[PDB]
Amino acid sequence: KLSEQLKHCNGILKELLSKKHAAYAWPFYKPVDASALGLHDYHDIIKHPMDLSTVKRKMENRDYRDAQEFAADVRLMFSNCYKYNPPDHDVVAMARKLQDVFEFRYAKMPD
Numbered sequence: 001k002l003s004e005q006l007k008h009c010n011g012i013l014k015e016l017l018s019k020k021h022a023a024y025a026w027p028f029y030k031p032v033d034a035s036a037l038g039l040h041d042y043h044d045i046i047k048h049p050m051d052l053s054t055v056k057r058k059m060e061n062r063d064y065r066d067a068q069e070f071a072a073d074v075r076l077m078f079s080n081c082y083k084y085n086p087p088d089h090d091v092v093a094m095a096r097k098l099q100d101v102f103e104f105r106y107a108k109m110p111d
C-alpha cells in the first residue's frame, strides 16, 4: 500500500514538474528567493517555506513515509502562496490552477 501510494505521489510530482503545467507551475519550481524579489516580509509571514524542488529532494531521499506526509508539503506550498499574496495576484491564480491538478489526481490515490 505505502510504496504503491508513494509511487502515485511520485507520479503526481512528475506531472506538476512536467511541460504540460509549466505556464502556471513555474513559480513553485524552486524556493521563493524573497531577497531577489524584494519580498523583505516573506520570512516574517511564512514560517515554513515549501516548493516542488524541496518535495522532489524529500521524495528522492525517501523522507516521506506515506502519501499524507507528501500531500501536507504540497498543500503547505499552496497555503503559503494564499497566506502571503493578495487573493487577486497572478501567482494566486497560478497556485489555484496547479492545486486543481494536484487535488483531482491525489483523489485518484490507489486504496
Ligand SMILES: CNC(=O)c1cc(C(=O)NC2CC2)n(Cc2ccccc2)n1
Residues within 6 Å of the ligand: 027, 028, 032, 037, 039, 080, 081, 084, 085, 086, 089, 090, 091
Ligand atoms: C510561490 N511564490 C510566491 O508566493 C510569490 C509571491 C510573489 C510576489 O511578487 N508577490 C507580490 C505581492 C507581493 N512572487 C513573484 C511573482 C510570481 C509570479 C508572478 C508575478 C510575481 N512569487
